[PDB]
């Protein structure tokens, strides 16, 4: 069933995760030489 078209459970969960996750992969690909 649908929760609320928004629920703020998982999403604002997995939001912080996915952050964390793309600033590592920016430090070693703009900092690498290629």
């Known amino acids: 069933c649908a929760v609320e078209l928004r629920s703020p459970g998982i999403s604002r969960f997995r939001r912080k995760i996915a952050k964390r ?4 992969l920016e430090h070693k690909r703009e900092n690498a030489k290629e």
Do not use: A, N, V
């Open 21 to 24: 996750s793309i600033k590592t």
